[PDB]
Design an enzyme around this catalytic site. Structure first.
Site, PDB file in Angstrom:
ATOM      1  N   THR A 144      -3.858   1.108  -3.782  1.00 15.82           N
ATOM      2  CA  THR A 144      -3.465   0.133  -2.835  1.00 15.82           C
ATOM      3  C   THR A 144      -3.301  -1.983  -3.082  1.00 15.82           C
ATOM      4  OG1 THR A 144      -4.716   1.048  -0.952  1.00 15.82           O
ATOM      5  CG2 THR A 144      -3.847  -1.747  -0.184  1.00 15.82           C
TER       6      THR A 144
ATOM      7  N   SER B  91       0.882  -1.084  -0.411  1.00 18.20           N
ATOM      8  CA  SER B  91      -0.067   0.239   0.462  1.00 18.20           C
ATOM      9  C   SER B  91       0.843   0.947   0.176  1.00 18.20           C
ATOM     10  CB  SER B  91      -0.946  -0.131   1.141  1.00 18.20           C
ATOM     11  OG  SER B  91      -2.032   0.970   0.954  1.00 18.20           O
ATOM     12  N   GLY B  92       0.388   2.675  -0.381  1.00 18.41           N
ATOM     13  CA  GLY B  92       0.769   3.703  -0.809  1.00 18.41           C
ATOM     14  C   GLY B  92       0.111   4.785  -1.306  1.00 18.41           C
ATOM     15  N   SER B  93       0.844   5.818  -1.024  1.00 18.68           N
ATOM     16  CA  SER B  93      -0.001   7.046  -1.258  1.00 18.68           C
ATOM     17  C   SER B  93      -0.596   7.117  -2.643  1.00 18.68           C
ATOM     18  CB  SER B  93       1.260   8.343  -1.403  1.00 18.68           C
ATOM     19  OG  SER B  93       0.190  10.047  -1.312  1.00 18.68           O
TER      20      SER B  93
ATOM     21  N   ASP C  92       9.443   6.133 -15.174  1.00 18.36           N
ATOM     22  CA  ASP C  92      10.188   5.272 -13.928  1.00 18.36           C
ATOM     23  C   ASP C  92      10.866   3.800 -14.367  1.00 18.36           C
ATOM     24  OD1 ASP C  92      10.492   5.446 -11.364  1.00 18.36           O
ATOM     25  OD2 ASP C  92       8.210   4.727 -10.457  1.00 18.36           O
TER      26      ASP C  92
END
Ligand SMILES: CNC(=O)c1cc(Oc2ccc(NC(=O)Nc3ccc(Cl)c(C(F)(F)F)c3)cc2)ccn1
Length: 247
Positions: free
Chosen positions: A22, A17-19, A123
């Protein structure tokens, strides 16, 4: 259309999970990954789905569908195994040179494809090259990263096909040395200033002794400060594909 109606996906184990989202393991006609996005991040959702739909290639994470009810969800295939990053830097796993080059070749195929579709990755890094079943490269964006930034990206559009090329050169570096660049600089802020200013660039002498001449050449060409001196992925793919015909 690739919309998946509510109630069809069984959402299982929360995976990370992240900013920005999820990810869960899922069931929908077999294993999938499900990436949940909040309602406020609609634009992100459309943009991520927009790019994923544009792709059909064995070395790109397979897009399968999306859901708007009851959540914004993106559905991809499920990959077993771990990131190239984890293989190179977290596990005593020392690949054979033949295997290293095969990874380089597949990554190059994927990146070549993305550019053919007018997609800049933005990225690329070893954390984003999945070794599906230990064998097949699945390039995606698993994030939810300065080491791979071109000097022009560092300086702050800065993102091009050629900034992708540079990140890939940094991936080459990891494959060929097993290490990350600038391991000796304890300071992230220092790396940003020096790489930007031109002052700093990876130590190519850190490569395996059995590293092929064509590959050290290539790597250094991918890492040129002036982005217009860097080669394109069709050339890169061709030099690698030639190099792998060392069988
Ligand atoms: C242990 N196994 C797992 O943890 C696992 C987790 C997964 O979760 C994921 C869910 C969604 C994504 N989303 C992307 O990748 N989005 C993407 C954005 C831009 C661009 Cl350019 C691309 C690109 F490059 F593919 F086209 C892809 C990535 C991983 C999937 C499979 N397996």
């Amino acid at each position: 259309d690739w919309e998946i109606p509510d109630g069809q996906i069984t959402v299982g184990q929360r995976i990370g999970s992240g900013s920005f989202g999820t990810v869960y393991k899922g069931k929908w006609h077999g294993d999938v990954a499900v990436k949940m996005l909040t309602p406020q991040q609609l634009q992100a959702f459309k943009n991520e789905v927009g790019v994923l739909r544009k792709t059909r290639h064995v070395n790109i994470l397979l897009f399968m569908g999306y859901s708007t009810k009851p959540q914004l969800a993106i559905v991809t295939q499920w990959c077993e195994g771990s990131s190239l990053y984890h293989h190179l830097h977290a596990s005593e796993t020392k690949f054979e040179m033949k295997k290293l080059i095969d990874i380089a070749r597949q990554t190059a195929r994927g990146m070549d494809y993305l550019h053919a579709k007018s997609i800049i990755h933005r990225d690329l890094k070893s954390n984003n090259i999945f070794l599906h079943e230990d064998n097949t490269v699945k390039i995606g964006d698993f994030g939810l990263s300065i080491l791979w930034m071109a000097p022009e990206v560092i300086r702050m559009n800065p993102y091009s096909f050629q900034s992708d090329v540079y990140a890939f050169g940094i991936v080459l570096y990891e494959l060929m040395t097993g290490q990350l660049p600038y391991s000796n600089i304890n300071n992230r802020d220092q790396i940003i200033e020096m790489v930007g200013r031109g002052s700093l660039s990876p130590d190519l002498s850190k490569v395996r002794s059995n590293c092929p001449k064509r590959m050290k050449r290539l790597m250094a060409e991918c890492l040129k400060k002036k982005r217009d001196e860097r080669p394109s992925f069709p050339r890169i793919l061709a030099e690698i594909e030639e190099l792998a015909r060392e069988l």
